[PDB]
Design a protein around this ligand. Structure first.
Ligand SMILES: O=C(O)CNC(=O)C(=O)O
Ligand SMILES: [Mg+2]
Ligand code: NI
Ligand SMILES: [Zn+2]
Length: 331
């Protein structure tokens, strides 16, 4: 069995191996990459996402979110307070202001310590889930706006044509902006490209140990758990690496830098934070191996998680028994 310790693997494809996305994902899985829940892919040196980032300041962040924490330093929830619209240029200036900028630090490990010690005491502002792309239309390899759609994958594997579309989203971050512990909708893959700026630190639980995380989460967030059998789908709960180690939860950590891709695998719980001003692009995707995870994915039916239009069909076709209840939560 390849990668039995479930370590995060790092790949360095050649330009020739970068030509066929599906084939390269399947190659990574033949080496056991999926067992970690997360892999890093460093693109060939010949590749570029686009020519420059000099013309992005007029993108609009229509609903910036202020991430307000409650709890203790190692175990907290965050809610997202809506703020007034601002451009990327305005957001970048805000991120670099004395109130929000990255503090002085020695290395990534010192910054991580500072994050976990101090995150709850501040409320950073995040631009999330902005539909759009920064890949040049003439970038032909690993262009996240030109990947095969999940609806086409389901049709190829299962024979059923469904409505829906699958497009990329941009994320503008600053110091301390945080992504809570979650798996992807319908336990999909994700791919994330860090276009520019400061790094992003990731934590991940191996898929084969996901239920261990879930059990801890129900203990640490007992009211939320009573409210919803799938409350991590609300994307609000944070648990530090010190708390995870204290509770014997298997996990790994890695820092992504600008110019690097990360892939999350089906049912790989992950969380993390941004080091400073940055811009990432991400999209969900599927492979044949995903189908069986889609059929088993939990779902939020309490009303909180409220998701994309296109998730309807996945629930309807892969989880017909759950469909009725889930849809009542969406209406
Ligand atoms: O960049 C982000 O906001 C964090 N991304 C993810 O959770 C992802 O790609 O799955
Ligand atoms: Mg612009
Ligand atoms: Ni994710
Ligand atoms: Zn819920």
């Amino acid at each position: 069995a390849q990668n039995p310790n479930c370590n995060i693997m790092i790949f360095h494809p050649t330009k020739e191996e970068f030509n066929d996305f599906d084939k390269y994902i399947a190659y990574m899985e033949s080496q056991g990459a999926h067992r970690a829940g997360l892999a890093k892919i460093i693109p060939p040196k010949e590749w570029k996402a686009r020519e420059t980032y000099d013309n992005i300041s007029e993108i609009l962040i229509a609903t910036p979110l202020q991430q307000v924490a409650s709890g203790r330093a190692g175990v907290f929830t965050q809610y997202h307070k809506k703020k007034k619209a601002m451009t990327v240029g305005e957001y970048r200036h805000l991120a670099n202001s004395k109130k929000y900028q990255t503090p002085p630090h020695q290395n990534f490990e010192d910054l991580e310590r500072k994050y976990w010690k101090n995150r709850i005491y501040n409320s950073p502002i995040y631009g999330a889930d902005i539909s759009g792309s920064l890949f040049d239309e003439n970038t032909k390899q690993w262009n996240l706006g030109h990947l095969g759609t999940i609806q086409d994958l389901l049709e190829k594997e299962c024979g059923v044509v469904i409505e829906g579309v699958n497009t990329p989203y941009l994320y503008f971050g600053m110091w301390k902006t945080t992504f809570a512990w979650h798996t992807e909708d319908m336990d999909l893959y994700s791919i994330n490209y860090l276009h520019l700026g400061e790094p992003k630190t990731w934590y991940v639980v191996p898929p084969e140990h996901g239920q261990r995380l879930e059990r801890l989460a129900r203990e640490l967030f007992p009211g939320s758990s009573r409210g919803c059998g799938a409350f991590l789908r609300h994307k609000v709960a944070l648990i530090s690496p010190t708390v995870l180690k204290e509770n014997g939860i298997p996990f790994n950590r890695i820092t992504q830098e600008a110019g690097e891709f990360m892939v999350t695998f089906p049912y790989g719980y992950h969380a993390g934070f941004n080091h400073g001003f940055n811009c990432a692009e991400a999209i969900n995707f599927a492979t044949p191996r995903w189908i069986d995870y889609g059929k088993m994915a939990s779902q939020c039916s309490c009303g909180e998680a409220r998701v994309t239009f296109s998730m309807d069909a996945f629930v309807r076709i892969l989880q017909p028994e759950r469909y009725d209840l889930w849809k009542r939560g969406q209406d």
